[PDB]
Design a protein around this nucleic acid. Structure first.
Lengths: 101, 708, 64, 95
RNA sequence: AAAAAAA
RNA sequence: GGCGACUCUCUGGUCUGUAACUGACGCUGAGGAGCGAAAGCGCGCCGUAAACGAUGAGUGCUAAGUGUUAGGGGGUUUCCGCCCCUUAGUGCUGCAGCUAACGCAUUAAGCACUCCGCCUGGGGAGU
């Protein structure tokens, strides 16, 4: 039972991974484009990122999250759609943070 | 897997089915687990692969086969291609190649078959059947050949010249603008044929440019003779009998505040400050419903017109100039009938008490917006001394408006404060100057006083629960607003909310953030392009833009027919007390047709108005060919970028004129990027342009980049 | 298109005056360019420093 | 001696008895090393713009002084050592 | 292109 | 050569203005000394560098137009702002002149004087 968390979005050109953690970076849940059985181009697309965010998010809501911080990594097209998918799943986004190395 | 696919297909094969997104299908099927959601997605993929369902480019799944098609409206282009606009606005546009139009013209309701292969980013289709024909009349320029004429259409979306047979000339000469009625449509290789219905004049004559536009949009010409007889018969003074059952307000300090050139003064106002610190606002509106009675000649014409139209060189009025400027106008220091809205307003801008009643006023003075500004803002001592008795009321008006505003903004109304052009023309209709229309304190005060009244009336009639007309603004398009939310995150502006459930305030926060930035004008503009248009409706569905539950138009019946109806319903329900079932059933039947019609006539008016502005802006820029201007990139496209000047004149930079590099459009960022140079022109960059070409007929301005 | 600090006659920018500096960062926290703000050169410098001090002292963020 | 401005942030997880002790300690450091405290604001517990040493807030103290380097230098030394003061800056007051 | 509102 | 997080510590220079003081105390400068990439490599020697804006230093003189950096003065202007003049630097454009032409053109490659470096066909051979 934790309410606040981070959603780490690694949007590459090939894929989008979405991990959700607590504030101490312990992993609540995750999804990815290829975990939802998208393959090739489709994993790259923002629709797969969107769906990856939802599935990561819906897993977090079971663990009883409400608010997110979001972190973005990588150049991919998924971050915009994926973020909206975290708002659309229900979880309010406090602040989004680009932490590209 | 197969049983699930059948169940989904059977559900979609129900007659009540409309095309739905993946999330809409999840909700409708009550899919709650993540594994059933995967099954839905794999099923939709498999069925879409088999061709049993079709995903539209708005990500909505529909059974083609019930269609294999989409019913929709043609939106043609001047290059010979078109787009289908589907009836379900939630669906995406289908591209139609020029060869696949099959004689369909702009506006025609068609049925389009969806092509199994797309050659590009959008879904392609073929026109199989034209259900309705939109274009019956065409304005254009007549041209004469040996044995026949042809008319070149002004609407460039009509890409083919209309054949005129020698008997269908009816007097038209070379270069005459003409109205053509279509006799036949295009078929195979044959062009459309038609007969000259009207000659407007030569294309080079003064004001045939504007007169063409009036005819293209089918805007109302002269008043009918019986309307002109009714208007002529109407008295130029009030009869003593009409003063019966009206509140005498002729001894009060009442004032109109309008433009200097305005002759149709709809509204007059008074503000008294009470001892407790609250304000008493009296809004007094021209009693047009008295003079123009139900089913009179002027009434039937006023419904057909729907609104007044305010073109560059002229106003086409909704009612004849004798009434509008004369007896209905709230002219200075003469007795005038008014339907009044009086409101007690506290220190928080809350209407505590109100009354709607018939009255007679005598306006103390006719003020302008410039004079009232000079008094309040510029602190002009000559004008204050001239209007010394009114100066105290003007200051209490200003404070009250500020209070109301604050309430309105707090409540979360969206202040969309953009720069509008005002084209100045001479008596001959030649363009003198294009200037920015500035909304001063005096306009924004009146505005507020018209808003609260409008809100007051609407709320009263909502709670009365009688058939009534509202002015609604529905929630924005979720797909359009989603894209807007993406667009603003590129500039760094992060919004709290989802596209399906956005509160107006959240939009206001953005417009506050971008204020006094270079990116203001465009984010503003793109936000606008995410909003729905506001329309009249019998139901009270609220007004998104004003963030209110109740809104109507009450305060301009001279120039708007829905305001004239509101007055008649006020008279019907409040004044006469006729709240009987038969009276209600009569109005409940007629308002939907009125609301739809008047809403159409407004949109028509706006389109024409704008079309004349763009023409006269183009006329202004003819002599500026070669001159450099500073401007801002208002829009970026695959073919080029639009640049708005300081006077709101917009022109294109075609990618051909970008000779320094091969520029690739980025759609996600809104930017043209040079491959080699790495120059990036984005929306909202300021640049210096030079005028290369201006086509007045086409209303085109072409720019080349001098520097960034 | 005028300088804040040349308009209002402000010779000394202070790092502590967080509100003032906050005008001159982007929403993300990045320093806003001179061309956007209209700042004078001189002050653009002063201002940059202050923000840089500010950010060090956690008054402002590096990445909002 | 020349004017400096010290600022520093005290960890947010202390009572006002402890806090005062800090201030007096570090005020004692400066005046002990030949400084003269000309001003002493207290900005009170602010939210930090980011999370310093796992604290999202802290108590800011802004000491003006006039002193030799030595004073400021000693302060800085001790400021670093101390766990109560989480961050600090000394700054010269530009003429 | 494309919003209110005003006119 | 080069130098971009912030603060403190020590320290070099430059520009403006005043003109109070000194009274030609200046300039150039072989050799010499010091600083000074890759590398070379053994951090130290090395030290050679399109370390070539392809353009020694100093001083004076010789049309204009326009931008920026840091100053000075006056004009209005409360000041902000504008306007003008001046100083130093950095830019573009362009007379006179110069140039084989290209170009340069008060940031000269113009007109001069001082002093220093350097060249005198290509190759052989930077052997």
């Amino acid at each position: 039972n934790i309410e606040s968390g981070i959603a780490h979005i690694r949007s590459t050109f090939n894929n989008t991974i979405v991990t959700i953690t607590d504030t101490h970076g312990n992993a609540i849940s995750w999804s990815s484009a290829g975990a939802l059985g998208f393959r090739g181009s489709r994993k790259s697309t923002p629709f797969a990122a969107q769906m990856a965010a939802e599935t990561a998010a819906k897993g977090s809501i079971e663990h009883g999250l409400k608010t997110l911080e979001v972190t973005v990594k990588g150049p991919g097209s998924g971050r915009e759609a994926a973020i909206r998918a975290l708002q659309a799943a229900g979880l309010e986004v406090t602040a989004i943070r680009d932490v590209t190395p | 897997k197969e049983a699930f696919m059948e169940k989904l297909l059977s559900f979609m094969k129900e007659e009540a089915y409309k095309p739905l997104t993946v999330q809409e299908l999840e909700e409708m099927l009550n899919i709650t687990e993540a594994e059933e959601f995967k099954e839905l997605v794999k099923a939709l993929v498999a069925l879409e692969e088999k061709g049993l369902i079709v995903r539209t480019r708005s990500d909505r799944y529909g059974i083609p086969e019930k269609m294999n098609l989409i019913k929709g409206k043609i939106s043609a282009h001047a290059k010979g291609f078109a787009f289908l606009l589907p009836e379900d606005t939630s669906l995406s546009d289908v591209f139609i190649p020029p060869n696949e139009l099959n004689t369909a013209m702009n506006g025609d309701i068609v049925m389009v078959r969806l092509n199994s292969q797309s050659s590009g980013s959008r879904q392609e289709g073929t026109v199989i059947r034209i259900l309705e024909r939109a274009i019956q009349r065409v304005v254009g320029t007549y041209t004469e050949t040996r044995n026949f004429g042809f008319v070149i259409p002004d609407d460039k979306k009509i890409t083919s010249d209309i054949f005129i047979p020698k008997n269908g000339k009816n007097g038209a000469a070379e270069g005459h603008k003409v109205v053509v009625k279509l006799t036949s449509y295009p078929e195979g290789r044959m062009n459309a044929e038609g007969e000259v219905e009207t000659i407007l004049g030569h294309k080079n004559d003064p004001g045939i440019d504007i007169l063409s536009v009036i005819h293209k949009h089918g805007l109302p010409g002269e008043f009918p003779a019986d309307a002109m007889e009714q208007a002529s018969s109407t008295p130029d003074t009030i009869d003593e009998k009409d003063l019966k059952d009206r509140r005498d307000l002729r001894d009060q300090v009442i004032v109109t505040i309008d433009g200097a050139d305005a002759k149709d003064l709809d509204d007059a106002v008074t503000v008294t400050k009470l001892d407790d610190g609250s304000y008493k606002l009296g809004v007094h509106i021209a009693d047009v419903s008295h003079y123009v009675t139900e089913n009179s000649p002027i009434d039937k014409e006023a419904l057909e017109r729907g609104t007044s139209v305010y073109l560059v060189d002229r106003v086409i009025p909704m009612i004849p100039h004798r009434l509008s400027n004369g007896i209905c106008s709230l002219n200075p220091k003469v007795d005038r009938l008014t339907l009044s809205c009086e409101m007690t307003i506290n220190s928080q801008g809350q209407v505590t008490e109100h009354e709607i009643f018939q009255s007679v006023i005598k306006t103390t003075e006719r003020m302008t917006y410039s004079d009232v500004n000079k008094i309040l803002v510029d602190d002009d001592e000559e004008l204050k001394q001239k209007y010394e008795p009114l100066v105290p009321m003007f200051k209490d008006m200003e404070r009250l408006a500020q209070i109301l505003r604050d309430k309105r903004m707090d409540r979360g109304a969206v202040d969309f404060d953009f720069k509008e052009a005002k084209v100045l023309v001479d008596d001959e209709g030649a363009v003198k100057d294009v200037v920015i229309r500035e909304r001063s304190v005096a306009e924004k005060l009146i505005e507020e006083f018209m808003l609260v009244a409008n809100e007051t009336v609407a709320e009263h009639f909502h709670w009365m629960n009688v058939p009534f007309i509202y002015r609604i603004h529905e929630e924005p398009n979720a797909e359009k607003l989603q894209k807007f939310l993406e667009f603003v995150t590129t500039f760094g502006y992060v919004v709290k909310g989802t596209a399906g459930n956005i509160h107006p305030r959240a939009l206001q926060s953005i417009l506050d953030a971008v204020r006094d930035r270079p990116e203001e004008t465009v984010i503003s503009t793109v936000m606008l392009r995410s909003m729905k248009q506001a329309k009249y409706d019998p139901q009270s569905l609220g007004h998104f833009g004003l963030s209110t539950e109740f809104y109507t138009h009450f305060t301009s019946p001279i120039r708007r027919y829905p305001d004239l109806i509101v007055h008649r319903l006020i008279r019907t329900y409040l004044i006469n007390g006729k709240v009987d079932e038969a009276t209600q059933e009569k109005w409940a039947e007629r308002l939907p047709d009125i609301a739809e019609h008047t809403s159409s006539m407004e949109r028509r008016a706006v389109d024409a108005e704008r079309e004349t502005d763009d023409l006269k802006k183009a006329e202004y820029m003819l002599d500026k060919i070669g001159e450099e201007f500073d401007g801002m990139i208002s829009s970026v496209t695959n073919f080029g970028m639009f640049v708005e000047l300081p006077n709101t004149i917009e022109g294109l930079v075609h990618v051909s004129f970008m000779t320094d590099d091969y520029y690739r459009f980025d759609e996600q960022h809104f930017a043209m990027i040079g491959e080699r140079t790495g120059n990036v022109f984005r929306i909202g960059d300021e640049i210096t342009v030079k005028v290369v070409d201006v086509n007045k007929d086409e209303r085109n301005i072409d720019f080349e980049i001098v520097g960034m | 298109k005028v300088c804040y600090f040349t308009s209002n006659g402000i010779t000394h920018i202070d790092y502590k005056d967080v509100d003032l500096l906050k005008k001159f960062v982007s929403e993300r926290g990045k320093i806003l360019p001179r061309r956007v703000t209209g700042t004078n050169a001189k002050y653009q410098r002063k201002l940059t420093a202050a923000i840089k001090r500010a950010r060090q002292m956690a008054l402002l963020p590096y990445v909002s | 001696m020349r004017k400096y401005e010290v600022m520093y942030i005290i960890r947010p997880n202390i009572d006002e008895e402890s806090k005062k002790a800090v201030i007096e300690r570090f005020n004692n450091v400066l005046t002990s090393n030949g400084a003269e405290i000309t001003g002493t604001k207290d900005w009170g517990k602010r939210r930090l713009a980011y999370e310093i040493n796992d604290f999202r807030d802290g108590f800011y103290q802004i000491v003006n002084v006039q002193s030799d380097a030595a004073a400021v230098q000693e302060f800085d030394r001790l400021a670093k050592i101390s766990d109560d003061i989480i961050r600090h800056i000394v700054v010269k007051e530009e003429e």
